[PDB]
Amino acid sequence: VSVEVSAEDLLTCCGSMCGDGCNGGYPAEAWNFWTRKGLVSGGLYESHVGCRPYSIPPCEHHVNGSRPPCTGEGDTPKCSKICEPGYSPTYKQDKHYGYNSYSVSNSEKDIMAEIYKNGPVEGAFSVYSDFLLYKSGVYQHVTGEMMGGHAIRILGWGVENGTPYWLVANSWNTDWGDNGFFKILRGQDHCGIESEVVAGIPRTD
């Protein structure tokens, strides 16, 4: 068990540098804020775990479940530089800083080495209509219209029936895709998956 870094804290307090909160942002800038300003703890919606738990309730992301459906993009919550009541210590004391941040070269070999040496990385890819419908297997865009960019966490790789892939975690809850995860084609910068990878080293060491 270890520190769960607060999506809320970064999303709400980064600002201009990172983009426009709930309406888009820059991951490279996000990693950079972590190095400069650091980030506090904070769990999932209504969990009361951490300094700043996520404040936007979960929903059904293009799947059927019991949760209310997702309704596009709402209001970026404000930046509250204080922890939830019932949590200690303070927000300043609760910050975790990154030592550095850096892009990872557009080589599947270089992305693979990075993950292997240092852990999971963040990357971005282009979501097409046919991606929404993903349940399992290895995703490979065929049909659909370009929908927009999507930032994710790449945590591994492998081969499923001759098809190489990246093991990727989405943030659309557990009832989407393969328990919230998905595999997407590896080695061809498919949908630009290898082209926008960013990572960094914890200040702790």
């Binding site: 520190v3 870094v5 999506a7 980030l39 971005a124 492998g158 914890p202």
Partner: protein, 47 residues
Amino acid sequence: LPASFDAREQWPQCPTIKEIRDQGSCGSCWAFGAVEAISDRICIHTN
């Protein structure tokens, strides 16, 4: 490099690697990929 890798196995001592979040109705995926990978790395490099 091995033909396969899954950080959930290489580092079972880090629960966050297996953890999936929900961004909700907000285009914050840019911040989600970041804090998730940062939670992982903090554990991998220390606690």
